[PDB]
Each structure stands twice: as structure tokens, then as C-alpha cells.
């Protein structure tokens, strides 16, 4: 199989396609991706017939900025008959995947596929039973076996394939299922919450997003990001000229520092987390983040970078390169990930974890 589907935000197919062509090309996994504007997915078609599997094994999924999820697929099934929906799909997967671990029947994240999405979510149940009977899925769900994907691009038209559970998104359509809490002071809270899910493995939350950690929230007003930190039972310095929501102040976990987040300097030396959702030029945000990391003012950070109008993949890769240049100059070891989150529009969210020897 040579085709790899990557799910993306509709309207970002060109970025998604440019990035995968670049990073696959770096590994001599040559191929091309067409770009259907607003389709909400990209298919990278490898030149070599089994490079699809090689790509999704060897290229780290965490290194892709503009893909929410990916999976390798076979040929397109068209005209699935309503009286015969099971056999053609079983036939596509037989001998492609055996004893797979989980089934996801997904669509592109467009308004047009909204009715198709409801069909897919329901079709999952009887299809899962049939694939289990056919031996394509293990009778019991297993986290370490591959995820089987059935991907509907239109009614009666689907791809079938898989992804490896240690090199993919753990979430349906690459989108963590989140409900906005009514007592949160802003909807932006979902950006940070989704970031925690995307960037920090679930079995590491209690250790890395820990009760009692100190955090700093730059440009915090009125408190959407501070809210997520408070819910992890952290103590937060919320830094802004604007006021913090009273609901947060009443928890007794929040200290409001009335300052510009760009000018703020911590005196406290045991800050675990710094987060930043400040609307400013990405080159300038990136420099502030690099200051915090190089000076060891925080151990981990999550922050947003606004995308420009054009050359978005190039420019955000350059922002990231600036931060890396600063880290290298000072011999600092850190892991950087970035992802255009579901709750991100014309921006990407970055996570950096700094290491001390």
C-alpha cells in the first residue's frame, strides 16, 4: 500500500501536503499529494507500492504539525450498496490486517460530512462485529494492535487501512472529545485542554500535570488557560493587566500579577509549567518562549503561535527553528512538538519539555 491519508483542518490541505511531501522526502520516501481545497484531508501517494507502511512506521507522527491523524489505505471503494454494506469492506481488509486492536470509522471534518459522520459512528457497531467474525479485528480490544480505519469520503465511498497505535493519534478523527465547562471564563480553555491530551500521554498526566505544581499563565485574562491549570490542582500565577474571573480567584489557587506577560520575570525558581496564548507576532512569542526555556524559568511549556497568511508551514517551521537555535547555543536539551489542534484556527500550539542533566 502506497497511499497515506492525513486528516487536517479544512482549508489547510496545502500546508498538510507540503509538510508530508517535505518530511517523507527527507527519508527518500518519495511521492506526491494532490490538494483538494477544503476537503479536510490529503492523500500522500508514495511512488513505491509498499512505502505507505514504511512511512507510517518510520516517520514519527509527533513530528507532523498539520496532520491531526494519519493511516495507510488501499484502493477506493465506490458505490457501497445499502443491501450489501459489510462484505465489500470485509473483503478489502481481509489479509491486510489480522487481529487488529480497534476500529474507527471516520470522515473528513467538514460541515458537508456531518450527516455522514452520524452514519459512521453508528455503522461502527455492526461493522466491528463483522470484522471480528472475519478475523480482521481481535474479538477483544487491544491497545497495542494496529487501529483499523474505514474512511468515508462520501456516502458509499470509503478507503480502508490502518495505523500503528504507537505512532498515530489516539483520538477519533484525531480530535479529543471535549465538553466546554460552563464555569470556565473563556472558550480558549479548550485549546489548552486539547493540548494536554495531544501532547502528554494519558498515563503520565498525574506525574507531569501534577497536583501542587506551580504554573505561570502569561496574558491570562480572563482565565481560560488558568482554569485548566487550576483543574489539575496547580497553583497559578496569572499574569495580565486585565482582571481574572472571580470564580478562579475564589479557588485560592490563583495569584493575579497585574503586569504585561511579555515583561514579566519570575523570581520563583520552582515553576513547573508556563503557558502562553498571547496574540502577538509569532517571531516575538517564540523569542519570549525561548527566554523562559534557556533561563530555566519553567520545565515544560505550552504556547500558541499565530500563522501568517502565506507560506504558513515554512514560517512556523522557522519560528520553531529560532527556539531550537537558542536551545543549541546554550547546550539545552529539550523535546519540541507542535500541532494545529482542532481548537486552533489560524494558529498552531507548541509543547516544549526541557531536560536537566
UniProtKB/Swiss-Prot annotation:
Q: Which residues form the active site?
A: 306 (proton acceptor)
Name the Gene Ontology biological process terms.
rRNA processing
Q: Could you tell me which InterPro entries the record lists for this protein?
A: RlmM_FDX (IPR040739), RlmM_THUMP-like (IPR048646), RNA_MeTrfase_FtsJ_dom (IPR002877), rRNA_MeTrfase_M (IPR011224), SAM-dependent_MTases_sf (IPR029063)
Q: Which reaction does it catalyse?
A: cytidine(2498) in 23S rRNA + S-adenosyl-L-methionine = 2'-O-methylcytidine(2498) in 23S rRNA + S-adenosyl-L-homocysteine + H(+)
State the UniProt keywords alphabetically: Cytoplasm, Methyltransferase, rRNA processing, S-adenosyl-L-methionine, Transferase
Which top EC class applies here?
transferase
Oligomeric and partner information? Monomer.
- Name of protein: Ribosomal RNA large subunit methyltransferase M
Gene name, per UniProt, is rlmM
